């Protein structure tokens with residue numbers, strides 16, 4: 661079964677603390693891991709949030725976009741085969 | 743040790759035609775394949791260019807950044823464990 665990684669992209673608008681919040685809320689990240697991934701996205705432009713089956717990855721991507729827009733942030737989230 | 747995927751990230755400055763050029767030249771993509779990946783960059787924010795050993799991935803990333811900046815484009819190219 662081929663799994664899929666969920667990615668978040670950097671942007672200049674979305675607050676760092678919201679990205680940490682998203683990682684903790686939707687990707688079961690510890691505070692430390694969420695902070696490191698957020699910083700990785702900031703530094704490298706993209707970061708890996710988790711790995712799931714195709715349909716679950718689709719769900720996570722959707723949940724992040726929904727949350728982000730309702731929080732008034734343009735945060736971009738997508739997926740790739742892992 | 744894993745192989746490593748080379749990624750190109752979207753930005754609001756780099757011409758589509760230059761992204762296609764980079765994919766053709768540095769990642770040996772056919773015109774259609776280069777176009778396909780470029781459109782993924784545009785719509786999803788990131789596209790996969792190729793998968794290589796670590797040192798070769800580093801080389802590709804470097805060659806893309808070198809080419810991009812000399813052509814006055816801010817195109818970001820990075821790598822992740824595949």
Ligand SMILES: [Mg+2]
Pocket residue numbers: 742824
């Ligand atoms: Mg893999």
